[PDB]
Design a protein around this nucleic acid. Structure first.
Ligand SMILES: [Mg+2]
Ligand SMILES: [Mg+2]
Ligand SMILES: [Mg+2]
Ligand SMILES: [Mg+2]
Ligand SMILES: [Mg+2]
Ligand SMILES: [Mg+2]
Ligand SMILES: [Mg+2]
Ligand SMILES: [Mg+2]
Ligand SMILES: [Mg+2]
Ligand SMILES: [Mg+2]
Ligand SMILES: [Mg+2]
Ligand SMILES: [Mg+2]
Ligand SMILES: [Mg+2]
Ligand SMILES: [Mg+2]
Ligand SMILES: [Mg+2]
Ligand SMILES: [Mg+2]
Ligand SMILES: [Mg+2]
Ligand SMILES: [Mg+2]
Ligand SMILES: [Mg+2]
Ligand SMILES: [Mg+2]
Ligand SMILES: [Mg+2]
Ligand SMILES: [Mg+2]
Ligand SMILES: [Mg+2]
Ligand SMILES: [Mg+2]
Ligand SMILES: [Mg+2]
Lengths: 80, 107, 70, 50
RNA sequence: CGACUCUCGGCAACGGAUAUCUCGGCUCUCGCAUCGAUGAAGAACGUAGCGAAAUGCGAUACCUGGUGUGAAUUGCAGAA
RNA sequence: GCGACGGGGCAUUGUAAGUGGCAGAGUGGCCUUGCUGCCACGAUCCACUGAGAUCCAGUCCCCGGGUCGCACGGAUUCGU
RNA sequence: GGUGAACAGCCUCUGGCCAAUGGAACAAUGUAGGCAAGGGAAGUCGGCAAAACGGAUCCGUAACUUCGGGAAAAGGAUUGGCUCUGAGGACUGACAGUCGACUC
RNA sequence: UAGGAGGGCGCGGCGGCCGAUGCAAAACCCGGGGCGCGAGCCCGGGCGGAGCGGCCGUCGGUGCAGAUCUUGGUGGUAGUAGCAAAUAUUCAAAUGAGAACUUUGAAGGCCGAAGAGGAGAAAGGUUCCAUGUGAACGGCACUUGCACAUGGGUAAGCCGA
């Protein structure tokens, strides 16, 4: 029946890890991430969840490159 | 004071009406109670051959009488609650059977 | 002085069931010092660790039965 | 399972390197407030979900 | 005389209120205009003598170089 | 005296193991037998045997019948 | 492995266990499982629950029927152990020899 | 009562005035003394260890017993209900501070092979193995462990992909 008997039959993964965002949201059969929208070129995000936006905007990671643009703007991007 | 004596224990009347999965386990307990009153020893050690005898017919058929010898001895082990211990063992028996055997004292 | 590592590795070395392994009850310390399959095989040779014989299941009563159904 | 991918084996390896109590000398540093590892994981209590 | 129940006081518990704080938040105002195929934002894995996280960094990996300063870093050890 | 054995009484079941049997449906083998032969197998039957086993555990009796073993108790409290 | 038609149930060998908190006692009321003189559904909304039947061999089997069924209808008898008797075979050179596991 | 108004009390800032405090501020505690019809207030004693108060004006996230109110903490219930499926354990010895529960030996039992046996797919992710261990955890306990700590361990032209 539903409930305990039916919960024993979880054996098959609907989602697995996504290469682009890293979350367990890649739907194997549909072949698209439910979180970031991969393989769609643009990223999946909505204005009806501002909280989900701020979990993944700029600044929540390293900013490997854009961290240094403020310092380069001062000194007007000098090239040695 | 060391003494060794021969006893006949009527296990039948002691275990009368006992649950089957407990009779031979309760037979061990009544051997132990018997010896404690027999020698005034709260420490009774049952020899492994006596244990084998009581279990020979399984768990629910226990010998109706047993001839044992009880030997009071010394706790030569310095670390012990009490001075003495008992060693209850199985005892050889004549072809006359248990006919006429009272409590004999071993030489 | 638990001898679990020795009761196992005796079954495996003697290639038998764990209920058929006999470790000598009077020299647990020699057994307890052997911590290896090599050391167990040495105890095997010295008679400190034997293989208990198989329990008895005879077909005499079946043979007599079949020999009376003839 | 025994059949796994390299990518899953890689992530499982990192998860193991992170199940360790903090070094004792961390507790001695100036202006320290770390008491214990607050992220320790046990395979039977919290599943990785991956 | 006692036990139990209720009660008053003293002491001791339980718990974290109150007070006193504050490298945090909130609000207002000002200045400026700077991401990306020359591969961004984001994700992953690595990386320290002793480190898991955070912070930092990329096999040159808690840094290399230049310049300024001018004698430390520090939980322990070591070259100094 | 008590306790444990043991003996007797009382009772339940229904004739123990072993021994022997010119008991036993029959069936093989071997004798110069000759039958009322000798060996071997054989459910059951018969005598020893109203036997054997059990019998207070909530049964009865036991001082000349018997074998034994026992403590000289620890501990707490009470004045009308 | 044995019983048996049987991967049924029941017992055993290889291998594996005795892991399910223990001790004492054995009131009511429970729960699970039995048995009950005489009667036999009178109980109850109601045969609910239980009991009765049950394998195999031989015999025998009605109405009705779409002629295939009904049918394992119904109704009877038998069943252990022991000691025998007969039948049913193979190969080898209407015979001789040897062998032979199984059924009735 | 519903309702309206006046005069007060109390809390926190701001502008001003007047002050207390390491010779002990705030907060809290008391069978301490008093004032006021009351809201409240003043003092004593203690605890504490660094801030605080009164008056005028002005301002506000300004007064709780309730909302099956929100969050946290705490009782009675109560050492109570309860720990009862899967037949079952017993004797010696070792160990140990401590053994009904660990280990060895012996005995008695069970699964009875469409298994309580031996191996895999999925799923898990180090649970595997050794050594050690204070607490916690293993709804009794434990010397013990699928726990904790430190180490070790997965080898392919032929098995797979
Ligand atoms: Mg549904
Ligand atoms: Mg399915
Ligand atoms: Mg699907
Ligand atoms: Mg009874
Ligand atoms: Mg789970
Ligand atoms: Mg007889
Ligand atoms: Mg007779
Ligand atoms: Mg058969
Ligand atoms: Mg079968
Ligand atoms: Mg009746
Ligand atoms: Mg009726
Ligand atoms: Mg009626
Ligand atoms: Mg009626
Ligand atoms: Mg009616
Ligand atoms: Mg019915
Ligand atoms: Mg009909
Ligand atoms: Mg305010
Ligand atoms: Mg308010
Ligand atoms: Mg309140
Ligand atoms: Mg109100
Ligand atoms: Mg209780
Ligand atoms: Mg229950
Ligand atoms: Mg099969
Ligand atoms: Mg292990
Ligand atoms: Mg516990």
């Amino acid at each position: 029946t539903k409930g305990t008997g039916s919960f024993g039959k979880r054996r098959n993964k609907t989602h697995t890890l996504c290469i682009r965002c890293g979350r367990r949201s890649f739907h194997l059969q549909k072949s698209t991430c439910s979180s970031c929208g991969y393989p769609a070129a643009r990223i999946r995000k909505y204005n009806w969840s501002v909280k989900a936006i701020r979990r993944k905007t700029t600044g929540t990671g390293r900013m490997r490159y854009m961290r240094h643009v403020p310092r380069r703007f001062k000194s007007n991007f000098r090239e040695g | 004071e060391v003494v060794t004596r021969e006893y006949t224990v009527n296990l039948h009347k002691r275990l009368h009406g006992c649950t089957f999965k407990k009779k031979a386990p309760n037979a061990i307990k009544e051997i132990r109670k018997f010896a404690q009153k027999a020698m005034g020893t709260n420490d009774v050690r049952i020899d492994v051959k006596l244990n084998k005898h009581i279990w020979s017919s399984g768990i629910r058929s226990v010998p109706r009488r047993v001839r044992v010898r009880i030997a009071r001895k010394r706790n030569d082990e310095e670390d012990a609650k009490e001075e003495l211990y008992s060693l209850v063992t199985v005892a050889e028996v004549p072809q006359e059977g248990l006919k006429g055997l009272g409590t004999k004292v071993v030489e | 002085v638990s001898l679990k590592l020795q009761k196992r590795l005796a079954s495996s070395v003697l290639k038998c069931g764990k209920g058929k392994v006999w470790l000598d009850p009077n020299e647990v310390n020699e057994i307890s010092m052997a911590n290896s399959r090599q050391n167990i095989r040495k105890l095997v040779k010295d008679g400190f660790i034997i293989r208990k014989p198989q329990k008895i299941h005879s077909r005499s009563r079946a043979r007599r039965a079949h020999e009376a159904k003839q | 399972p025994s059949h796994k991918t390299f990518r899953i084996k890689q992530k499982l390896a990192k998860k193991q390197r992170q199940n360790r109590p903090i070094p004792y000398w961390i507790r001695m540093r100036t202006d320290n407030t770390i008491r214990y590892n607050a992220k320790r994981r046990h395979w039977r209590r919290t599943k990785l979900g991956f």
